[PDB]
Swiss-Prot record:
<keyword id="KW-0378">Hydrolase</keyword>
<feature type="binding site">
    <location>
        <position position="101"/>
    </location>
    <ligand>
        <name>substrate</name>
    </ligand>
</feature>
<keyword id="KW-0964">Secreted</keyword>
<keyword id="KW-0929">Antimicrobial</keyword>
<comment type="similarity">
    <text>Belongs to the glycosyl hydrolase 22 family.</text>
</comment>
<dbReference type="GO" id="GO:0016231">
    <property type="term" value="F:beta-N-acetylglucosaminidase activity"/>
</dbReference>
<feature type="disulfide bond">
    <location>
        <begin position="30"/>
        <end position="115"/>
    </location>
</feature>
<dbReference type="Pfam" id="PF00062">
    <property type="entry name" value="Lys"/>
</dbReference>
<dbReference type="InterPro" id="IPR019799">
    <property type="entry name" value="Glyco_hydro_22_CS"/>
</dbReference>
<feature type="disulfide bond">
    <location>
        <begin position="6"/>
        <end position="127"/>
    </location>
</feature>
<dbReference type="GO" id="GO:0005783">
    <property type="term" value="C:endoplasmic reticulum"/>
</dbReference>
<feature type="disulfide bond">
    <location>
        <begin position="64"/>
        <end position="80"/>
    </location>
</feature>
<feature type="domain" description="C-type lysozyme">
    <location>
        <begin position="1"/>
        <end position="129"/>
    </location>
</feature>
<keyword id="KW-0020">Allergen</keyword>
<dbReference type="InterPro" id="IPR001916">
    <property type="entry name" value="Glyco_hydro_22"/>
</dbReference>
<dbReference type="GO" id="GO:0005737">
    <property type="term" value="C:cytoplasm"/>
</dbReference>
<dbReference type="GO" id="GO:0005615">
    <property type="term" value="C:extracellular space"/>
</dbReference>
Length: 129
């Protein structure tokens, strides 16, 4: 599923991401925009053999199991395919654990490089929330 911008902001807000660990909703929508272009089916292979999955590009090195990342963890206790569903519950729940692990949203490389320090409120501008 390719979410619309305001459609994804609503779903993130319903699942409790707005100001989760102090990150306003616009941060999460910006992160999704540059990680997956709002596409729940996005995948990308990392150089070390791990793979990032879904709308927030969550990495199999630490957070999910895909059966093909030897030595990795499954800290969110989910198959990585659950992160590709049109329902974003799994991605949001796992995002909440990642963002709580000490490093905030710096765990998302695209957020650090393309959202951090910008007007992230622009990303929820005009949305009925
Ligand atoms: C929280 C998380 O899994 N972030 C990943 C990061 O691990 C990975 O290096 C990158 C590759 O582009 O995508 C995402 O930002
Ligand atoms: Cl915001
Ligand atoms: Cl594995
Ligand atoms: Cl959803
Ligand atoms: Cl933080
Ligand atoms: Na894993």
């Amino acid at each position: 599923k390719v979410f619309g911008r305001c459609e994804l902001a609503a779903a993130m807000k319903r699942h409790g991401l707005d100001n989760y660990r102090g990150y306003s909703l616009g941060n999460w929508v910006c992160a999704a925009k540059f990680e997956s272009n709002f596409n729940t089916q996005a995948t990308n292979r990392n150089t070390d053999g791990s793979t990032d999955y879904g709308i927030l590009q969550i990495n199999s090195r630490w957070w999910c199991n895909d059966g093909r990342t030897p030595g990795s963890r499954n800290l969110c206790n989910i198959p990585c395919s659950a992160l590709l569903s049109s329902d974003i519950t799994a991605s949001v729940n796992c995002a909440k654990k990642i963002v709580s692990d000490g490093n905030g949203m710096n765990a998302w490389v695209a957020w650090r490089n393309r959202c951090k320090g910008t007007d992230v409120q622009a990303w929820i501008r005009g949305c009925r929330l």
